[PDB]
Symmetry: D2
Subunit: 121 residues, 4 copies
């Protein structure tokens, strides 16, 4: 793939992929595994977010993509989505700022750049 690696739930600044994206690129992502967003036995999350028996605020404790400090939903993954801004791709477990210290585990994520922007001319 274009990048595969682990996304630690404790990394408040997320994980750098080294992928530089341009508006109009298309990408696909899949994410596997389990993390904790708190020490309580219930505070598990898949990339899609917290287990529904303990919901958290909108988009919190979900896997997101940061592109140039814009934030996009990813969750368990996306297929052939258009990149709407230029920027480096950072993957982030979107916990509340300052609450990462009780997080543990990591997701295994694959990213494919399906295409680089080139328009019909």
């Amino acid at each position: 793939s274009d990048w595969s690696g682990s996304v630690p739930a404790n990394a408040e600044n997320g994980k750098s992929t080294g992928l530089i994206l341009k508006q109009g690129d298309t990408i696909s992502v899949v994410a596997h595994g389990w993390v904790k967003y708190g020490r309580d036995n219930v505070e598990w999350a898949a990339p899609d977010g917290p287990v529904p028996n303990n919901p958290q605020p909108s988009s919190i404790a979900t896997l997101v993509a940061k592109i140039a400090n814009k934030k996009f939903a990813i969750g368990n993954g996306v297929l052939h989505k258009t990149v709407p801004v230029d920027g480096e791709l950072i993957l982030l477990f979107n916990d509340v700022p300052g609450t990462f210290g009780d997080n543990s585990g990591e997701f295994q994520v694959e990213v494919i750049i399906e295409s680089r922007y080139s328009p019909l001319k």
Copy 2:
């Protein structure tokens, strides 16, 4: 996409997609959401499988693909995987046979046929 729909957790025979696959095709799948594989408060499953605070045997209670009565791991998703046998793609919550009655909920799944088999000649 080529197919998008829900896959009920209580469907012992899965969800038929109507996608007729051939050996050599390649597909991508992403799966979102949550299901219950049992009545207990901890018996939640992502497509990847049960939440690890109540682990189940390998592959059990995970989203799988059935093609020609063969099962293949899918989980939260797969990217550009080659199909090894002809048959219609069936999406299945791979619970223990006979234990589908205590299941509820459904996953939301998208399937893309990335390519139809054609070799260099």
Copy 3:
């Protein structure tokens, strides 16, 4: 493929493919074979255009895509190009208006819709 067929050189209005494209879709095309853009034995064209021993004006006698009555270069083919406007894909041998009567032959063309527009959100 999504569409495969022949594009006749003598069709002043091109060949309608039935592929309804939206802005943001991406497509790939490959074009094979040879056509006559005139009755002389020198007036041969590949999809990229006239054989350069009898050159014609820019874009003339080349395979182009017509979408929303706008013309885009295709030639021998394109890979993963972004569609800039909505409309049915029309494949056109781009001969001088009024000069299609002395044309003959057809290209063998394949089109794949690589993705349907869907932005990260």
Copy 4:
């Protein structure tokens, strides 16, 4: 693209792309432009081969791919084709051996590795 560049018609050993393909990968290629396979005014060829008013033996003076010292037709291009052998992708103007000395020009070729072999399992 994974690789793009020129394929000189006078290169008897073709052009090495540095793409190391594996059996089960899929690729797309498109090739543009015109070359001479001889010094006479009619000995032009597109990637699909010579202009048909001076036809040459089958596959001669076409753009082919060499992988594992086997030969595959490419021509003006191919979409999402499965690679049947392991090797580096070599792009070659398939002139009769020993007759490259009267060739000139080059095709402009783009190659995309559409996917790397990974089966459903």
